[PDB]
Amino acid sequence: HEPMRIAGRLVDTDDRVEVRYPWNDTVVGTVPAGRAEHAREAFAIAAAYQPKLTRYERQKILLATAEALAARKEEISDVITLELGISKADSLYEVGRAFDVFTLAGQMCIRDDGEIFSCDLTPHGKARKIFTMREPLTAISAITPFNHPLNMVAHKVAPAIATNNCVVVKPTELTPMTALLLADILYEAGLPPEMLSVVTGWPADIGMEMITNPHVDLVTFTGSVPVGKLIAANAHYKRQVLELGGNDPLIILNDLSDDDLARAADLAVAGATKNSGQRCTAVKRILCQESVADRFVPLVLERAKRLRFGDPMDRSTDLGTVIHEKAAALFEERVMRAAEEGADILYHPGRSGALLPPIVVDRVPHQSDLVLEETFGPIIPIVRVPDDDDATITLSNSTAFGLSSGVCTNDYRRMQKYIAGLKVGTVNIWEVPGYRIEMSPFGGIKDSGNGYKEGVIEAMKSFTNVKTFSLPWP
Amino acid sequence: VRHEPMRIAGRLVDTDDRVEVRYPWNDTVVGTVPAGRAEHAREAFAIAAAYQPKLTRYERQKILLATAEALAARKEEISDVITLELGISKADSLYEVGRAFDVFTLAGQMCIRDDGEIFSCDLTPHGKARKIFTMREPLTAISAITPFNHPLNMVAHKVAPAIATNNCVVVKPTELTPMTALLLADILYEAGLPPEMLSVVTGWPADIGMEMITNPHVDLVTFTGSVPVGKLIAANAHYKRQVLELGGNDPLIILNDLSDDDLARAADLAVAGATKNSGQRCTAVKRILCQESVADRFVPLVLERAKRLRFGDPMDRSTDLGTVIHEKAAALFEERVMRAAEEGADILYHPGRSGALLPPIVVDRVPHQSDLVLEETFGPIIPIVRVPDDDDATITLSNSTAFGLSSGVCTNDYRRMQKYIAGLKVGTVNIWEVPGYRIEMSPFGGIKDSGNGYKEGVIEAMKSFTNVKTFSLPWP
Ligand SMILES: NC(=O)c1ccc[n+]([C@@H]2O[C@H](COP(=O)([O-])OP(=O)(O)OC[C@H]3O[C@@H](n4cnc5c(N)ncnc54)[C@H](O)[C@@H]3O)[C@@H](O)[C@H]2O)c1
Ligand SMILES: NC(=O)c1ccc[n+]([C@@H]2O[C@H](COP(=O)([O-])OP(=O)(O)OC[C@H]3O[C@@H](n4cnc5c(N)ncnc54)[C@H](O)[C@@H]3O)[C@@H](O)[C@H]2O)c1
């Protein structure tokens, strides 16, 4: 049992949200069923506190947080694993990522991107200089999804501390214990408590206050398309950064050697299954050009069968469960349905509740639910595509989504064609769509996002207002 | 009376119903444009969406600089069109052609610039021998909605950076001053712009306005205008990027360290800033916050300078100050001055209004809560608010409205400049200049009710009109 953390204070309610372990379906935790008034309190505090931390101070707090994450890595990945169900291997890696996010935000504190303009540029010119500076906002509202219960929170909070913002986080009711623990880490690392609250409860009770509270200057939301478009229909006059679903391809081009196909098959299986497939930039469609597929698909199958799927707490498990059994059952149905439409299931040892094996299916029609909709689980679906780049680019672009992509090829002419032609936020050559560093620009277009970039650097910019000032300069 | 059609991707499109355009000097019809409907906007957006510009950076620069040169060659004709539908003086409308020339020149020059970035990826334990590179691509279509106060320059600020960036833009200028936008579309097509890159549609906001906000092809809405209309658009442009630049109510602050020569200089700034373009700038001086102990010396200098302004027929070359937008606007601002006087203000100079022609009224001892200075009063009123000889109290009063766009601070004391720069809740603090001072390429935009927090000006508009795409390559 864990209360809300409202500016450093433990806050409770009579009602409870239960948090269950997807492996077991047992209750492993409880948090408050928070209401509009808790968020309201959290925001009034955030609005009123004016952080004074120097850049050195902010850096100390962020670097001390990284060290605490490293020192408590097993404890934290256990909490992640117990609410989300992903393997210890995946949750320990997630802690590694959060350690990088805090570390980099800490180091970004020394950087000042101020610019200077001279004003004698036109016949209207003046002997004057204009300078820019950045300042924090009144309050930030962050709403996070279940797939990285630690790292999504780190990406929203670390840039807020680094720019002297006060943030209120509402993690998902599915995986809220990890955010609450991060809050405690932060306060113990020296964060002035009014800079961070973590509130919890049902989306119908507390969700809308996160979107409409008068003090909020910026709402930063990561989650599903429908919830994203709902928020977009309601945050009247606030900035919103909405980072929504992905459905991302790994594209295998026909110039590859057999050895290259093995390396591509390594990227395919890892891309489709890491974090149980629960990444917005997971490989969700492997688009394999006809003339190499016969060679490529048996290499994928061989690698998928090595994956050990089972008890998430076992350090030798590769693949843990998905978020719940309902999601599992749904991805299984999409497979079974793609198979009625002509797909060829090549490996499916059987679902067990929320535990899905890394099912391999070949000849997936591009228009079936499995690959046209976002399938947020460890399916490894191969879609055979024509030996023609334009048709391949057309088909890759034919869903509602556009976040990231991976292309494997050695021919530079074709690399550049895919780079220019895919309608996505990122094109990775010879990497999975999931590849990024914590500070490069990250965000999609089309239904994958409203068009703002994130990652530590862009989030820091997003979280401030630029003020200019000009001075006589004779 | 000039009757003009819409410009839809180069085609001249008329409707039978007309929007009459009146000259505020004598209230007569000088023009008509079409009462366009949702389907005109819808057609324009379908063309914009389907056209993929292929212009090289060189060809964009040629078009943009040819457009600058045609604004210069035709400045008389263009400033006549502006004055006839807005009523600002020829002096002010000629100035506005000069600014649009700078906007187009600067955008053409910015086409050579590539702000791409490179990241090495072997930074952490999760490393990789790899580089990430960034590049920018255009949007599907941009919707631009523009206000009456700069009928050319506001269209230029929205259109030039779209062209520089291979975007296609649909403009709906205000129904009060649409003729200037249509002339600029002509000039652009004739400077070599592929016509599918620009449409100008016209009509009543009840007919065509919602289509500009909600059309399925529009990636970004760029709107400049009043707070309430801006809040409506914000609320209706679901899942679109929005650049919303709304009202200002900007202070010029006179600090008590200034000598009596410095006060004469500050008075030049107050009078120019309060009255330029008939006071119709979102960054006009609309509140002169003068610290009490210098106010008795500063006010007479303001008074002397205000009485030098010639106000009259805007087409007369001897006019400095022409009309405001219409008679109703002019009456409202006079009525706010009369209300301020009943609540304690002192009207020092008021030669009388006639119709939409408001003289540069000087009022002292204006209460800071009165409507004149608390609300945005978009006319050539010169209102002095006496404030305490204390910087904390001054800053608090300056920050006490719903607005936060620009500001100006007159002082010689560095410590006090820095305190105002850091303490004023605004987008810009100009030291020893009017709030309205900027170059066409520095970041422009306000906070609070003054803007949804995105910057404009040529450089920032170019960035907001693109998507950044990243790519990464093996780099062993
Ligand atoms: N950066 C990205 O683009 C990115 C990264 C990771 C995940 N995702 C997307 O996240 C999705 C999975 O996450 P999820 O299932 O938690 O998504 P979700 O959209 O169901 O919920 C995400 C968050 O929104 C909150 N929420 C739900 N209803 C709400 C309401 N009415 N008002 C306010 N808040 C509300 C939830 O409580 C949760 O905190 C996938 O589609 C994935 O692609 C995107
Ligand atoms: N950068 C800035 O912040 C900036 C610069 C200059 C002017 N302004 C502001 O503009 C205002 C003066 O201009 P205005 O009177 O033309 O403002 P306005 O808000 O009345 O109209 C501006 C535009 O919005 C359109 N519009 C009106 N109703 C609409 C609707 N329902 N749907 C869609 N579009 C609609 C108008 O037709 C016009 O094109 C002042 O408040 C001034 O400060 C702001």
PDB file of N, CA and C in Angstrom, chain B residues 13 17 29 32 46 54 110 131 140 156 165 169 173 194 198 245 280 308 340 362 404 416 444 462:
ATOM      1  N   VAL B  13     -11.926  33.439 -58.546  1.00  0.00           N
ATOM      2  CA  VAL B  13     -13.169  32.807 -58.226  1.00  0.00           C
ATOM      3  C   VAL B  13     -14.078  33.871 -57.579  1.00  0.00           C
ATOM      4  N   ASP B  17     -23.039  36.830 -53.844  1.00  0.00           N
ATOM      5  CA  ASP B  17     -23.048  37.608 -52.601  1.00  0.00           C
ATOM      6  C   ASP B  17     -21.675  38.282 -52.406  1.00  0.00           C
ATOM      7  N   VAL B  29     -18.225  52.705 -49.616  1.00  0.00           N
ATOM      8  CA  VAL B  29     -17.749  51.443 -50.153  1.00  0.00           C
ATOM      9  C   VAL B  29     -16.646  51.804 -51.067  1.00  0.00           C
ATOM     10  N   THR B  32     -15.343  45.515 -53.106  1.00  0.00           N
ATOM     11  CA  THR B  32     -16.129  44.361 -52.736  1.00  0.00           C
ATOM     12  C   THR B  32     -15.230  43.142 -52.974  1.00  0.00           C
ATOM     13  N   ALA B  46      -7.841  21.287 -50.664  1.00  0.00           N
ATOM     14  CA  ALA B  46      -7.610  20.048 -51.485  1.00  0.00           C
ATOM     15  C   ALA B  46      -6.471  20.257 -52.498  1.00  0.00           C
ATOM     16  N   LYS B  54       8.442  21.400 -55.364  1.00  0.00           N
ATOM     17  CA  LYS B  54       9.705  20.778 -55.661  1.00  0.00           C
ATOM     18  C   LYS B  54      10.722  21.860 -55.810  1.00  0.00           C
ATOM     19  N   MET B 110      17.000  33.543 -45.857  1.00  0.00           N
ATOM     20  CA  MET B 110      17.005  32.376 -44.958  1.00  0.00           C
ATOM     21  C   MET B 110      16.942  31.034 -45.685  1.00  0.00           C
ATOM     22  N   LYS B 131      25.768   7.490 -36.288  1.00  0.00           N
ATOM     23  CA  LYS B 131      25.410   8.897 -36.173  1.00  0.00           C
ATOM     24  C   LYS B 131      23.913   9.059 -36.458  1.00  0.00           C
ATOM     25  N   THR B 140       1.451  19.114 -44.880  1.00  0.00           N
ATOM     26  CA  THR B 140       0.441  18.935 -45.950  1.00  0.00           C
ATOM     27  C   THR B 140      -0.152  20.291 -46.439  1.00  0.00           C
ATOM     28  N   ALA B 156       2.197  38.815 -45.267  1.00  0.00           N
ATOM     29  CA  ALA B 156       3.580  38.493 -45.567  1.00  0.00           C
ATOM     30  C   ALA B 156       4.252  37.603 -44.532  1.00  0.00           C
ATOM     31  N   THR B 165       9.765  27.367 -47.284  1.00  0.00           N
ATOM     32  CA  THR B 165       9.776  26.094 -46.635  1.00  0.00           C
ATOM     33  C   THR B 165       9.011  25.002 -47.511  1.00  0.00           C
ATOM     34  N   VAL B 169      -0.071  27.305 -48.607  1.00  0.00           N
ATOM     35  CA  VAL B 169      -0.839  28.002 -47.560  1.00  0.00           C
ATOM     36  C   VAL B 169      -2.135  28.541 -48.146  1.00  0.00           C
ATOM     37  N   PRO B 173      -7.887  36.432 -45.149  1.00  0.00           N
ATOM     38  CA  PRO B 173      -7.695  37.728 -44.456  1.00  0.00           C
ATOM     39  C   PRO B 173      -9.029  38.159 -43.798  1.00  0.00           C
ATOM     40  N   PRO B 194       4.550  28.908 -57.871  1.00  0.00           N
ATOM     41  CA  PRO B 194       3.596  27.879 -58.391  1.00  0.00           C
ATOM     42  C   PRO B 194       2.300  28.121 -57.699  1.00  0.00           C
ATOM     43  N   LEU B 198      -0.432  28.933 -52.984  1.00  0.00           N
ATOM     44  CA  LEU B 198      -1.125  29.977 -52.241  1.00  0.00           C
ATOM     45  C   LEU B 198      -2.542  30.174 -52.718  1.00  0.00           C
ATOM     46  N   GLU B 245      -1.341  34.024 -31.955  1.00  0.00           N
ATOM     47  CA  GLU B 245      -0.696  35.284 -31.448  1.00  0.00           C
ATOM     48  C   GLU B 245      -1.837  36.306 -31.211  1.00  0.00           C
ATOM     49  N   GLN B 280      -2.830  51.011 -33.683  1.00  0.00           N
ATOM     50  CA  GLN B 280      -3.253  49.659 -34.014  1.00  0.00           C
ATOM     51  C   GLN B 280      -2.082  48.663 -34.206  1.00  0.00           C
ATOM     52  N   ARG B 308       2.228  67.953 -31.623  1.00  0.00           N
ATOM     53  CA  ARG B 308       2.889  68.085 -32.914  1.00  0.00           C
ATOM     54  C   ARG B 308       2.267  67.207 -33.993  1.00  0.00           C
ATOM     55  N   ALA B 340     -12.375  56.932 -17.734  1.00  0.00           N
ATOM     56  CA  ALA B 340     -11.208  57.137 -16.964  1.00  0.00           C
ATOM     57  C   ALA B 340     -11.274  58.549 -16.310  1.00  0.00           C
ATOM     58  N   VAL B 362      -4.219  62.903 -24.866  1.00  0.00           N
ATOM     59  CA  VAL B 362      -3.310  62.698 -23.714  1.00  0.00           C
ATOM     60  C   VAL B 362      -4.126  62.710 -22.415  1.00  0.00           C
ATOM     61  N   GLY B 404       0.654  39.652 -21.826  1.00  0.00           N
ATOM     62  CA  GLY B 404       2.085  39.567 -21.612  1.00  0.00           C
ATOM     63  C   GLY B 404       2.773  39.391 -22.957  1.00  0.00           C
ATOM     64  N   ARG B 416      18.642  47.929 -12.238  1.00  0.00           N
ATOM     65  CA  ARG B 416      17.195  48.048 -12.477  1.00  0.00           C
ATOM     66  C   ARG B 416      16.790  47.484 -13.842  1.00  0.00           C
ATOM     67  N   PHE B 444       9.392  36.266 -31.954  1.00  0.00           N
ATOM     68  CA  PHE B 444       8.295  37.161 -31.557  1.00  0.00           C
ATOM     69  C   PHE B 444       7.118  36.328 -31.026  1.00  0.00           C
ATOM     70  N   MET B 462       9.534  29.590 -39.924  1.00  0.00           N
ATOM     71  CA  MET B 462      10.144  28.521 -40.780  1.00  0.00           C
ATOM     72  C   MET B 462      10.309  27.207 -40.062  1.00  0.00           C
TER      73      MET B 462
END
